[PDB]
Amino acid sequence: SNAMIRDYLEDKPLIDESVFVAKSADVIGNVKIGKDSSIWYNAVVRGDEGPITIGENTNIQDCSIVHGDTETIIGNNVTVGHRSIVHGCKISDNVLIGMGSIILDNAEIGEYTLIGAGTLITSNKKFPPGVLIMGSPGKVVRELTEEDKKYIDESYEWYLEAAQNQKY
Amino acid sequence: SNAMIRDYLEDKPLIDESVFVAKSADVIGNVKIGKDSSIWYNAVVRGDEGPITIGENTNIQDCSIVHGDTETIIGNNVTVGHRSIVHGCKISDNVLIGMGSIILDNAEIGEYTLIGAGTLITSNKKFPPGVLIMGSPGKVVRELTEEDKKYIDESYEWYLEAAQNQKY
Amino acid sequence: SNAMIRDYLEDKPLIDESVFVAKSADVIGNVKIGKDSSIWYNAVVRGDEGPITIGENTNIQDCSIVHGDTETIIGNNVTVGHRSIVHGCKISDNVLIGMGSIILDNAEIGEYTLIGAGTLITSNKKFPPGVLIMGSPGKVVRELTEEDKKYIDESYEWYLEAAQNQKY
Numbered sequence: 001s002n003a004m005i006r007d008y009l010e011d012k013p014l015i016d017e018s019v020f021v022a023k024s025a026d027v028i029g030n031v032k033i034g035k036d037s038s039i040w041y042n043a044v045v046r047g048d049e050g051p052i053t054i055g056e057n058t059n060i061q062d063c064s065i066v067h068g069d070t071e072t073i074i075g076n077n078v079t080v081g082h083r084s085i086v087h088g089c090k091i092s093d094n095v096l097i098g099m100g101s102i103i104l105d106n107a108e109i110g111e112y113t114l115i116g117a118g119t120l121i122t123s124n125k126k127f128p129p130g131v132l133i134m135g136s137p138g139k140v141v142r143e144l145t146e147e148d149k150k151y152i153d154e155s156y157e158w159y160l161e162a163a164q165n166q167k168y
Numbered sequence: 169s170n171a172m173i174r175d176y177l178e179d180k181p182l183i184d185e186s187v188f189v190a191k192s193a194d195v196i197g198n199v200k201i202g203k204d205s206s207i208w209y210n211a212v213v214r215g216d217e218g219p220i221t222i223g224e225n226t227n228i229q230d231c232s233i234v235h236g237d238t239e240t241i242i243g244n245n246v247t248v249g250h251r252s253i254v255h256g257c258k259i260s261d262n263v264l265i266g267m268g269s270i271i272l273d274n275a276e277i278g279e280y281t282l283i284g285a286g287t288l289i290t291s292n293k294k295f296p297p298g299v300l301i302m303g304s305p306g307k308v309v310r311e312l313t314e315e316d317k318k319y320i321d322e323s324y325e326w327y328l329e330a331a332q333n334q335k336y
Numbered sequence: 337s338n339a340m341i342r343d344y345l346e347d348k349p350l351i352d353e354s355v356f357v358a359k360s361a362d363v364i365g366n367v368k369i370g371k372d373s374s375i376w377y378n379a380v381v382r383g384d385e386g387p388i389t390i391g392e393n394t395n396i397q398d399c400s401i402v403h404g405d406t407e408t409i410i411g412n413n414v415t416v417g418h419r420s421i422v423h424g425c426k427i428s429d430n431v432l433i434g435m436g437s438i439i440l441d442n443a444e445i446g447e448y449t450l451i452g453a454g455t456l457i458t459s460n461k462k463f464p465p466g467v468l469i470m471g472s473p474g475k476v477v478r479e480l481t482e483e484d485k486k487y488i489d490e491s492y493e494w495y496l497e498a499a500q501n502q503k504y
């Protein structure tokens with residue numbers, strides 16, 4: 001990278017050709033989106049402060065908002081539930097964020113984690129992988145079962161499929 | 169119905185001609201919206217998983233989201249407050265869902281129910297009719313008064329008028 | 337004012353030429369927005385019931401909603417965090433509303449107030465100036481320090497820049 005490239009990246013999201021982006025969604029600024037991910041209706045992914053990196057096969061559902069003081073990193077195979085706010089945090093692979101949840105700056109969610117709807121995770125909170133987290137403030141309920149890790153897998157898989165239909 | 173009609177239904181919402189749908193809203197997939205209902209700014213009504221049925225005189229306020237693993241049924245004279253998430257549940261007639269509430273799959277709300285702002289009702293939760301429900305998790309506070317039922321009517325009634333002003 | 341002006345004001349927001357309004361935002365009805373403020377992606381500012389007044393240098397972040405039974409007043413130098421609902425309340429100058437908060441009708445927030453993410457303030461609730469409010473229901477945590485008030489100023493200031501960059 002160089003001066004002109006940094007300017008380009010500040011203005012033009014690097015969105016993989018394979019990514020479904022609903023017309024009503026706004027993907028603004030410095031945003032890298034990986035293979036087969038999907039951005040749903042009225043979502044806002046704005047990398048104008050901290051940049052945003054979204055992995056592969058990850059879904060950002062309707063009206064969800066991604067923004068951040070520091071960088072926001074969302075892994076591969078992640079499901080971001082409807083109207084969730086992922087703000088400057090770090091989300092490992094195979095995480096399902098329950099609809100309406102808010103995860104604030106510098107929080108870290110470990111791999112194969114399930115987050116209940118409407119969960120509020122304040123800044124700098126770390127969580128071990130393989131757990132169920134719920135509530136406000138979000139706390140660990142129990143370790144995840146193989147059946148739970150599966151549910152996580154079916155969710156992102158479903159979205160891979162629905163994503164095709166919304167333009168094929 | 170037949171194969172061709174089922175295919176039409178997965179792509180074209182059945183929206184009664186009287187319904188007001190803000191331009192910024194997204195009504196997508198298998199969705200049926202009845203007479204004199206209204207869909208407000210940036211709402212998202214997505215019936216691409218469980219189909220969605222919305223009754224008559226029912227208002228879905230700004231940035232609300234209707235989606236579901238299972239079928240979502242919203243009755244008549246229902247007021248879905250700003251930014252609510254109604255997901256795979258059953259909402260009876262004359263219900264006012266407080267703004268920012270989240271009602272999950274298979275949950276069931278009885279007729280003439282008033283729900284406080286910011287309420288979180290998890291899946292399969294059921295409630296009797298004629299109550300004030302409130303909080304996270306949502307619980308019944310008391311039974312509804314005539315005064316409360318009137319307020320519920322005035323609410324949807326106001327939206328019938330406002331919707332017409334958004335057409336004329 | 338007169339009949340024709342009242343009718344114009346009910347249909348056409350008074351937006352200062354200086355204000356950045358994202359294309360995906362809806363600014364509807366009787367809304368007045370002051371110098372150097374900014375309305376972000378997919379926000380809805382609807383003054384079709386109570387009118388809305390937004391001061392100078394104030395930012396209404398993504399998917400935030402402004403609406404109200406009664407009048408809604410937002411002062412100057414205010415930061416309205418992502419997905420907040422500011423509903424028929426009175427917000428003083430230099431206030432930062434944490435993302436995902438809900439402030440209901442007739443609530444009154446004083447100058448130099450910091451509100452944590454996900455806070456739910458019900459109607460008629462009142463707070464003094466110089467405090468940190470948080471939770472559901474929102475309560476005062478401690479008075480604000482100079483370091484805190486600075487944070488408030490830097491927040492709206494950052495948005496002034498950002499708004500400019502979303503135009504040049």
Ligand SMILES: [Mg+2]
Nearest residue numbers: 024192210360
């Ligand atoms: Mg939109």
Ligand code: NI
Nearest residue numbers: 067068069418
């Ligand atoms: Ni932000």
Ligand code: NI
Nearest residue numbers: 082235236237
């Ligand atoms: Ni859903």
Ligand code: NI
Nearest residue numbers: 250403404405
């Ligand atoms: Ni309202």
